[PDB]
Design a protein around this ligand. Sequence first.
Ligand SMILES: *[C@@H]1O[C@H](CO)[C@@H](O)[C@H](O)[C@H]1NC(C)=O
Ligand SMILES: *[C@@H]1O[C@H](CO)[C@@H](O)[C@H](O)[C@H]1NC(C)=O
Ligand SMILES: *[C@@H]1O[C@H](CO)[C@@H](O)[C@H](O)[C@H]1NC(C)=O
Lengths: 434, 100
Amino acid sequence: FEHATTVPNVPGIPYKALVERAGYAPLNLEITVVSSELTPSTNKEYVTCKFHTVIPSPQVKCCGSLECKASSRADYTCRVFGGVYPFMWGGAQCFCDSENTQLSEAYVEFAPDCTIDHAVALKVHTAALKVGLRIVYGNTTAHLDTFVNGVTPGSSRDLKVIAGPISAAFSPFDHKVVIRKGFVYNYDFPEYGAMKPGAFGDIQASSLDATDIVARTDIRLLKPSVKNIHVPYTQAVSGYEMWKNNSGRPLQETAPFGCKIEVEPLRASNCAYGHIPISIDIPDAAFVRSSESPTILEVSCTVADCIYSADFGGSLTLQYKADREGHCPVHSHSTTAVLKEATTHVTAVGSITLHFSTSSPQANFIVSLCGKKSTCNAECKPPADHIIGEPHKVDQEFQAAVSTTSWNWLLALFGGASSLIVVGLIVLVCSSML
Amino acid sequence: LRADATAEWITGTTSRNFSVGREGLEYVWGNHEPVRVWAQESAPGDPHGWPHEIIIHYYHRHPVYTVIVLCGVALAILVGTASSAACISKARRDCLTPYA
Ligand SMILES: *[C@@H]1O[C@H](CO)[C@@H](O)[C@H](O)[C@H]1NC(C)=O
Ligand SMILES: *[C@@H]1O[C@H](CO)[C@@H](O)[C@H](O)[C@H]1NC(C)=O
Ligand SMILES: *[C@@H]1O[C@H](CO)[C@@H](O)[C@H](O)[C@H]1NC(C)=O
């Protein structure tokens, strides 16, 4: 038997329904989202870290011209200075008076500690939601994982559940994502080969051990002022360090719908944002015939101290005079009130107590025991506790959040105004007919 | 949908107020685990009682909705009274115009 329903995306908060075939006893269907994740498809643009500036040993040629060629090194900057007179410990360094030339080199590479402190730039595509479902049908429990895409069946051969497309697409990650040490940021890094000095991604490579490193740090070589053999140079600050200084807060703290960002792979787990259509092909072995289940001769429902809140606030008692002892499901036929218990054991005569959670100020709903309705009818009070540590199990909706003796006043005033309209109209017609 | 995230370094002994809605709010304090809280409809009134208690209870929960409902019912009774008065006045002058 195939049953289609719609569950909330909130992790935890089990969803209850009952399945009623024409010739079979109803059974409880119990759909719980125990876990979820929203993993986008990522491709790595580059890696980056704080660069290490390598200044090689200077070249000195004693009154003979020097020039330097192009190099494949990362941000290779070169300059030649003529008319030098270098000195080291020991004395002068060339045999020639004032035509001596010095060639100064400079480039960058990865720091030795980039194996730990480094950032990875990613472009992420549309994310797919995969949920872990606990399905209790009758009294059989199955745990599975399914993709929320509309056509892929769940990971269960004996149940064949299909999760329909998600109500809305959330995708907490922006198009460009930076990951550093498990911290995830929505940063718009520059493209590969488009380095900017003093900003993030000033040095880039395909991997940490890659040899094709490219960088555009603002390095420049100065003419040596004193006559030692140092290489004077000025460079822009490390754009990786500059980004670390003002990275802001990661997406683990700034992400809607209260779901936590995890790496390896990049994903957002336990997001509560939409509604998932779920279709279950319940096997016929789970069903039982209507004659097998105990029957209800009469049943009455009395609600005692209904308190509308997020937890299971409110209790009701079903008094029944059933036939033969047996277990049968119970349900609340309302979208504004959900029971706590699913199946109960009934005897020849007695009363059973159930706990329910509602978002409406009145307990005005139909409770079915063994498939037999009971139409519970009472009032509920606003809660005393302002703040609770669990989410609401029932969505709040109009026409139920407004109670009677508040609907009564509105209907009375509207009916009075309409009564004045009708009496004015009929007196006008009576005057016109004369 | 709107994660109004705040981050602040606290020194000394202070107090911080945070508005919590039905969707909930989490706070992390130092190295502690995140703590999640949710707000209930605990408005200081009475949905089943005299009308002023109902109005203040539903005004603390959803202000603008109840204000426009009150404006709508006031407009409805005003238009109904005015139209009924106009109709009965027209009928009265139509019945008394031959006698005059
Ligand atoms: C389900 O309940 C029925 C009646 O209570 C019982 O006979 C049966 O063994 C139960 N099934 C399982 C799998 O526990
Ligand atoms: C940058 O770093 C300096 C010292 O490292 C610090 O004082 C400053 O607050 C940081 N942030 C900005 C935005 O300048
Ligand atoms: C925080 O809220 C309480 C109760 O609403 C109030 O008494 C207090 O003044 C508020 N504190 C601040 C700093 O606004």
